[PDB]
Amino acid sequence: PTIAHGDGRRPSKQRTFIVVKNCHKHHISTEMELSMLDLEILHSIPETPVEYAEYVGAVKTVASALQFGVDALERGLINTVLSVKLRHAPPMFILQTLA
C-alpha cells in the first residue's frame, strides 16, 4: 500500500511481491551392533536354568541397544534443530543497525 500526497510528485501504481521459500532437508544416521551369539539363542527355547540365564542376559542387552538407539535419534533431532537455528542467525553487531 501507498500514501496519497499533495506534492506534485508522480503517484505510484499498485504493487505485489511474490516470494518463494523452500525446504532444507537433513539426514541422520546411527549404528547398532548385535553379537551373533546373542542373536542365536533368542530363536531357541531355553530348558535348563543356564539357558534361561543366557536368554535373559541376551534380552537385557538387546533392549539396552534399542533404547540407546532411540535416545541417539532424539539427541540428533535436537542437535539438528540447533544447527538450523544457528546457521541462519546473523551476528549482533550487524543486525542491530540493519534492523
- Taking the complex as a whole, the smallest distance from the CB of residue 2 to other proteins amounts, in Å, to 21
Q: How many CA atoms lie within 13 A of 76 on its CB side?
A: 12
Nearer to a second copy, 24 or 47 (CB): 24
Q: Does 72 bind a second copy (CB under 8 A)?
A: yes
- Give one DSSP letter per residue of 17-70, joined into a string: -------------------HHHHHHHHSPP-SHHHHHHHHHHHHHHHHHHHHHH
User: Residues interacting with other proteins, by CB under 8 A?
Assistant: 36-37, 39-40, 43-44, 52-53, 56, 60, 63, 66-67, 69-70, 73-74, 77
- Give one DSSP letter per residue of 8-23, joined into a string: SPPPPPP---------
- Taking the complex as a whole, the smallest distance from the CB of residue 39 to other proteins amounts, in Å, to 7
**C-alpha cell belonging to residue 27:** 539426514
Which of other proteins, a second copy, none binds 81 (CB below 5-8 Å, type-dependent)?
A: none
- Which residues of this chain interact with a second copy, rule CB under 8 A? 1-6, 11-14, 23, 26-33, 65, 68, 71-73, 75-77, 79-80
